Design a protein around this ligand. Structure first.
Ligand SMILES: C=CC(C)(C)c1cc2cc3c(cc2oc1=O)O[C@H](C(C)(C)O)C3
Lengths: 359, 359, 359, 359
């Protein structure tokens, strides 16, 4: 019985994390998804939601439904590639979930409701050993970004952790290479051109806390403040205070792009920065940061499981002739997919390090 | 002048019924809107929502927000073109609204939660006299359709009424003319190509009772069943049981089209049908059934306030040469705008009638 | 002996034919694609275009480029899993094409500029033996639809043929089943809700031969006349003069749907038609007509290779209870994709019939 | 004293220039648009194009057509507010156009074919005295931006001029205030989030000069290099070589946004830049630069006739706290509409100076 995982919340977020783990060949062999929790109990509806994705395509594993015991009123178990996964109804308090009863040690917290560390602590109270929140968190709760600071994970200090946000997983790797290769970042402003999300609205509606955010998403360019760039200060502490940014939400189904403008801490050139991103992508950042030097458009990154894919041609063509300090770096991300794979990545690293803490 | 109306539901259909009421020029004069009820009190947000509409342009009446009470909090009063409108909060049960206090007889029920007649009766119990449900109603409730059967309204029998759906308001006028002109309708199947609405999702979401309906709205053609053709059978009783249809939700912001195929009861031609539609549009259906003989696309009907706009070119060019019974009729509708007007249109109707049943 | 194919026009439909072939593992076994002819000569552009597709995803095979001879400046040769394909420069006169010089016997003509039989006959003067026109043709070219009338191909008479259109290929199989099984078709009118195409415009532009068709495509529902349903009259002679239709162009990037309404020649029921279509898809229309009984939306048909995919839940839910004559049949098609696989299928049919016709 | 205008090209940009002129109430009054020149001469089609606009709504003037003479089969004259506009046939050479004959003094060159100053100088041989190119020009044509350097117009030396691009007209007013008010620009990088335009494709098409630019426009984010920021150097020579930028083409049909990142020449703050922007907009930039402090989205700028509308909240909320040198400025533009009114503003300014010159 390998790593024992539970997913709390089985909306699009939980769903895409599950399929990211099936995609990396982890189901039933490296990770056991014991259960999934949601307010919906219709397993046939979940199976359907898992089989067809308007942007990602067709799930490649068969998904059937069954009954945990012949008593049960209706199917409550999803069967994915042979593996039985139980559906459990959602609780107001995570401390009520039957984590312990189930044998689950790691909880992927994807509901979006238990983003504060002490709210998220409830899962450990219910029997779980570790919680990975699949969004930014508050109340402290180590924020960890794979390929950037994930070695700061300390098995019994960090029980409840944040995998950050999809925008921060795109930008952090770029900033990380800029700092690690010696260019440094004195000041930087980030603009993310963002595909719509599920908190947006088909037609102008009501969004009291974000007035622009409530307007019709598929026919507008909608500005929004965002915390992703300031959040990079948690994972790359030298940048606190030096970086902030904004989003413009645009009418594409998925795939987003970061437009980073920044002043380097030493004289350099867009060419040396471009060679360092490529070198990093092939070595220490492999699987987290890639680059393209082709003429790609957003559709071409769909299903890319890298966190950040540097656009070499867009970057080399639109920077200032012989500039030594003031540069623009363009990098893409499949806002839904790379992040999901990183959630799984973070869960495995933690497990690996946890098991190591017992050796 | 008088006529006291209160809109329950200040969401998108309520503000559009409200703006439909202002554009023409009835706020305060022949109609005085006194209060609006909604789950939010922010009056400042409400004014922002009224002022900017992605599809319909900018409201052309100035709107402000003053206080009404020292001691409660911010504002709660809309001031549109010199008229004060008060925002009250919503309550689980409709018989808590101060309709008598405020002195509102006619209530435009638009929240979507009180479609069952009995719930609509609640406003009666709150001091209001008559009620117009701005959606297809149930529990029994006279379904009136301006231009078709509205003049069936009985001030003594009908207190709670439903103005049907925007789709039924586009279909029933065409069908009315086919029946009234003696073309007859033996059998018919309608297809409505409908812009996406607010019950839809930007990305693949959760939609339990309509699996297709839960899929990503602005990148898909989404088929749906609809009761709008069956509803024509309640309003034009000779078609009862002979009509049905479906919907295809497509990625456009507003404006929909009815694609009606039908078998006439006797021998005709599309040219006689076409003449008869044009002739009624200029007469007995004038203001309700309009037509176009131009090369229009759905953006050309934005803000058209007819209920149904017959496309003569599309109908004449796409029918079988020499056919006598089997016909296709195409008609457009700004699903938002036209209907909004029809609600205010109905409201006046009854005011003109039910006065003269009290007087 | 691999049949030697040449593709005139290496625009979208030519590419998609090529992709369809590689996928079926035919390239270099049953078919040798010797050359693609187009106005552009840039093999590296062709390779870019083949690699990335915004709707169909990344091409899963490796594409590289080479030089036919060292002389040649830029690459003029596409290489796919070792299969070498010469990029030849288009000619205003197809008779100057070097088909004979290349040993090409079958030309797939997909530029849309040689759809007249007499113009496409220029390929034969160039050295080809047979031409398949990948659109509706004129001047008396035999029109063949796979699974419907393709056995009417006659090797000694039919040298330039038409594979009809994508819509004709979705519609025709439905009508064939109806007519073949004895339900029959007395009258019928089709509506296609179609994804926009390359002929359309991004913003309101110029289109003097289709006024509506020049308006902005991704924000409008755009009506258009269409010869698809009438063309069914050429492939299924008994339907001549009984069927016509129209199109509505909607803002989805790919995947379309036929909304057929018809009067059957005998008394039936929707249940009986539904059962026939499913049986036929499983047997004599296998590979041509598929069905679904799932809750699918347009994106779920992307890359479906069938010509027509009958929607059983949409058909069964939106028809008249107990009706015996007047019906609605819903069927999908990936307008691009199913049709390109049929082009390939027609070519193989033709090559087998030609081989049998000589010895 | 009305000036005599001719419009070369009556495609969308020429049409929007003529609509802007009309909207400013100039038609017949200050300006005699004598004729429009295009490959189409069907006056009925131009009437239809002008009457309906998917993005800008219905023309506010009535458009009818007539014939220059009785024989004129197809009408060839457009009539707005009883002003007659002759539709003349486009020529391969501007020098062969009949401007002297017609008495045209100013030609608005909008085809995009004659952006080379010496190609646009053909109009002069045709009988015109001045040419305004409604695009960036090459070959030494003087580039004039209203509100920034338009008083550099020199009647005796500038005969063929450029009104720059819609992007340059949005940026230059912003850089112009920074420089004029003493903040200065040491270096700047601009990103424009632009609406798709008529050069893009509905589906992946052919675009040998811009590989990315040939990809499906309404479902992609499409990077593109751009000359707009560097061109700011021709209008404010002090920024020569200090500015450059890029575009991301997104699937909105109109309205774009400039996201400028720059480093100021001396310490300042985002509050002082904001106050200067706002103050210039009420004074010397009035009508050219506007601002909003409301929660606006792109559709709220449709039909805004400014060149640049500074977004105060999006600017003030998304900069680095206490920053003295490194800032972001956000400004919107209706890319069609603002620029079209600037084309007319530039002709009326040239006419006043040429008028004053002769004295
Ligand atoms: C657009 C105008 C009005 C009358 C407001 C309107 C409302 C409306 C609401 C729903 C719908 C179709 C509709 O069509 C319309 O025309 O399908 C939905 C479900 C509930 C999925 O069946 C809910």
């Amino acid at each position: 019985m390998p790593i024992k995982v539970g997913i709390n919340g089985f909306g699009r977020i939980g769903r895409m994390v599950f399929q990211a783990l099936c995609e990396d060949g982890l189901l039933g062999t490296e990770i056991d998804v014991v259960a999934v929790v949601d307010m919906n109990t219709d397993a046939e509806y979940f199976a359907y939601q898992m089989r067809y994705d308007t942007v990602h395509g067709k799930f490649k594993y068969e998904v059937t439904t069954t009954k945990s015991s012949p008593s049960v009123a209706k199917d409550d178990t999803l069967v994915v590639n042979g593996h039985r996964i139980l559906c459990v109804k959602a609780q107001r308090n995570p401390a009520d979930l039957p984590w312990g009863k189930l044998g689950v040690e790691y909880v992927i917290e994807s509901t979006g409701l238990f983003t504060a560390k002490a709210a998220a602590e409830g899962h450990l109270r219910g029997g779980a050993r570790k919680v990975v929140i699949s969004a930014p968190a508050s109340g402290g709760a180590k924020t960890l970004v794979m390929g950037v600071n994930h070695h700061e994970y300390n098995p019994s200090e960090h029980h409840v952790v944040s995998n950050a946000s999809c925008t921060t997983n795109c930008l952090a790797p770029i900033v990380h290479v800029l700092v690690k290769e010696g260019f440094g970042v004195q000041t930087g402003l980030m603009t993310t051109i963002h595909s719509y999300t599920a908190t947006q609205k088909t037609v102008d509606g009501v969004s009291v806390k974000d007035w622009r955010g409530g307007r019709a998403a598929a026919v507008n360019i909608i500005p929004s403040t965002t915390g992703a760039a300031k959040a990079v200060g948690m994972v790359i502490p030298s940048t606190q205070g030096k970086l902030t940014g904004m989003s413009f939400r645009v009418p594409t189904p998925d795939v987003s792009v970061v437009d980073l403008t920044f002043t380097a801490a030493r004289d350099t050139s867009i060419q040396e920065i471009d060679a360092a991103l490529k070198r990093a992508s092939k070595t220490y950042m492999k699987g987290i940061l890639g680059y393209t030097d082709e003429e790609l458009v957003s559709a071409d990154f769909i299903n890319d499981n890298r966190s950040s894919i540097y656009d070499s041609k867009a970057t080399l063509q639109n920077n200032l002739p012989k500039e030594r300090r003031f540069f623009k770096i363009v990098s893409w991300y499949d806002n839904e997919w790379g992040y999901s794979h990183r959630v799984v990545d973070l869960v495995r690293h933690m497990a690996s390090k946890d098991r190591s803490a017992r050796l």
